[PDB]
Write a protein that binds this ligand. Structure first.
Ligand SMILES: *[C@@H]1O[C@H](CO)[C@@H](O[C@@H]2O[C@H](CO)[C@@H](O[C@@H]3O[C@H](CO[C@H]4O[C@H](CO[C@H]5O[C@H](CO)[C@@H](O)[C@H](O)[C@@H]5O)[C@@H](O)[C@H](O[C@H]5O[C@H](CO)[C@@H](O)[C@H](O)[C@@H]5O)[C@@H]4O)[C@@H](O)[C@H](O[C@H]4O[C@H](CO)[C@@H](O)[C@H](O)[C@@H]4O)[C@@H]3O)[C@H](O)[C@H]2NC(C)=O)[C@H](O)[C@H]1NC(C)=O
Ligand SMILES: *[C@@H]1O[C@H](CO)[C@@H](O[C@@H]2O[C@H](CO)[C@@H](O[C@@H]3O[C@H](CO[C@H]4O[C@H](CO)[C@@H](O)[C@H](O)[C@@H]4O)[C@@H](O)[C@H](O[C@H]4O[C@H](CO)[C@@H](O)[C@H](O)[C@@H]4O)[C@@H]3O)[C@H](O)[C@H]2NC(C)=O)[C@H](O)[C@H]1NC(C)=O
Ligand code: HEM
Ligand SMILES: CC(=O)/C=C/[C@@H]1C(C)=CCCC1(C)C
Ligand SMILES: CC(=O)/C=C/[C@H]1C(C)=CCCC1(C)C
Ligand SMILES: [Mg+2]
Length: 335
């Protein structure tokens, strides 16, 4: 009939570096029915047992896992997790697939809600990723070796053979250009415009060993291990401080860009969207998403309504800090 979803965990008691690739969290191969998706972070946590190995977890489990495994900062964890859950999880069972559809998330919600997992395209997951191809080309979740080869190429050209912040700036812009030129459904606005910059610095801030204090840069071996194999480097120690999107601003400034998309189902036809969220108008992202949730859940009642209200509030608690103050919306009133 359903779960009563608890408020998100706070920060971990211990916030320093530590061994995360340890005896209690061994890499193991996929079994039948195990789910993996477009996020190398969650994928690696699932394959080392920080998350359930089947790739289906509660919001609370995702938050604690991203903190324990990578020292992902608490508010950033709350923003990403409840965003993913509101749009893509099952609010009644309190379960989110880190990939595609699975019976493991329980009885489906009323359409047009889906609980289809992080693989679902168009409101959260979107285009111009580093190691995943645009959904237009048929597969938005699998590792793509051609794209990884470009990641290596750009690390060679701009980072001495390593991925660092200079590489991130160049690669991000170049991936946007690829999508403009080849993807007539290319969209780069709202949630995706914001997340696309953060994702490019997560490899630097979270995938580089926390014992590296200076000149933080990711080897291609470590990159392949995580992005392709869902495996922590040997002896991997997490970031020494909670972290998330530090430096994303510099990535944007290296190649200024404006939210938008290819119009009228044509390539090389990128038109700006002045209504989209951007980095000086973050609250629009909050409003946009609450709107999206209303489209998914036009008239909820009972436990679904109750759990929607709670999850929306949980998300707001993170958003309010991360976005620097947003007026809470109450599309379903109060409890
Ligand atoms: C990601 O990874 C990449 C790769 O590892 C990393 O890239 C490094 O980035 C830093 C800076 O961001 C680079 O270091 C800087 O290089 C600047 C450019 O250097 C060239 O030009 C220099 C300036 O020449 C002057 O003088 C000549 C006359 O000789 C004149 O014609 C010119 O007009 C000009 O006025 C020159 O000095 C330099 O040449 C020396 O060094 C090279 C080795 O690269 C050697 O071959 C030469 O023989 C010579 O010894 C070069 O050709 C440079 O301007 C800059 O200088 C500042 O720092 C010094 C040292 O601290 C200060 O004392 C000085 O006041 C300057 O302000 C500096 O050295 C570095 O080279 C990059 N490395 C590579 C491999 O590309 C990114 O940073 C990473 N990203 C992140 C975020 O970490
Ligand atoms: C892994 O991920 C890569 C990258 O996303 C995927 O490969 C891309 O595949 C698409 C579709 O097959 C390719 O797009 C097509 O490009 C053609 C020409 O592009 C040239 O220019 C680029 C540089 O900008 C070169 O890199 C490239 O080699 C080409 O020489 C166009 O002719 C195509 O457009 C036609 O069809 C569309 C669809 O309706 C129309 O809108 C157009 O008007 C037109 O008629 C098309 O866009 C793309 O170039 C590939 N990129 C790379 C880097 O290879 C892989 O599919 C994926 N791998 C696996 C195995 O899944
Ligand atoms: C906390 C909850 C998290 C959620 C819900 C989440 C969700 C997602 C989603 C949906 C994508 C795909 C983006 C797209 O195609 O548009 C993605 C990409 C990514 N995530 Fe996560 N993520 C989370 C945490 C993390 C953590 C902790 C890390 C790093 C340790 C991480 C690193 C990345 C990276 C690097 C990508 C880009 C992959 C690529 O472009 O090749 N994420 N994430
Ligand atoms: C929506 C999302 O996943 C991430 C948002 C970022 C956070 C958490 C803080 C500052 C910059 C951003 C607003 C892009
Ligand atoms: C913090 C920020 O700028 C954006 C972060 C997102 C990205 C990049 C992918 C997974 C996690 C988020 C959904 C928070
Ligand atoms: Mg993507």
């Amino acid at each position: 009939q359903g779960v009563d979803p608890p408020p998100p965990p706070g920060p971990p008691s211990f916030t320093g570096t530590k061994l995360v690739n340890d005896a209690d969290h061994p890499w193991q191969p996929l079994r039948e029915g195990d789910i993996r998706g477009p996020c190398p972070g969650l994928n690696t946590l699932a394959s080392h047992g920080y998350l359930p190995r089947d790739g289906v977890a509660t919001p609370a489990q995702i938050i604690t896992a991203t903190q324990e495994g990578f020292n992902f900062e608490n508010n950033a964890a709350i923003v990403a997790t409840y965003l993913g859950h509101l749009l893509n999880g099952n609010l009644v069972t309190d379960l989110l697939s880190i990939g595609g559809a699975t019976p493991k998330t329980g009885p489906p919600p009323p359409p047009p809600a889906h609980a289809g997992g992080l693989n679902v395209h168009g409101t959260f997951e979107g285009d111009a990723g580093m190691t995943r191809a645009d959904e237009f080309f048929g597969d938005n979740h699998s590792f793509n070796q051609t794209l990884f080869d470009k990641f290596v190429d750009f690390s060679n050209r701009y980072g001495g053979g390593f991925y660092n912040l200079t590489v991130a700036g160049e690669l991000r812009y170049s991936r946007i250009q690829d999508s403009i030129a080849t993807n007539p459904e290319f969209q780069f606005k709202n949630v995706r415009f914001i997340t696309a910059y953060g994702e490019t610095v997560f490899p630097i801030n979270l995938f580089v060993d926390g014992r590296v204090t200076t000149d933080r840069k990711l080897s291609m071996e470590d990159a392949a291990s995580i992005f392709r194999d869902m495996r922590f480097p040997d002896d991997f120690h997490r970031s020494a401080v909670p972290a998330s999107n530090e430096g994303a601003d510099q990535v944007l400034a290296a190649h200024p860009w404006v939210p938008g998309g290819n119009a009228d189902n044509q390539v090389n036809n990128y038109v700006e969207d002045p209504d989209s969220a951007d980095f000086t108008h973050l609250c629009r992202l909050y409003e946009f998403v609450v709107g999206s949730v209303q489209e998914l859940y036009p008239n909820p009642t009972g436990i679904l309504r109750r759990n929607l209200i709670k999850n929306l509030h949980y998300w707001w608690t993170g958003v309010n800090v991360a976005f620097g103050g947003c007026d809470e919306l109450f599309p379903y009133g109060q409890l």
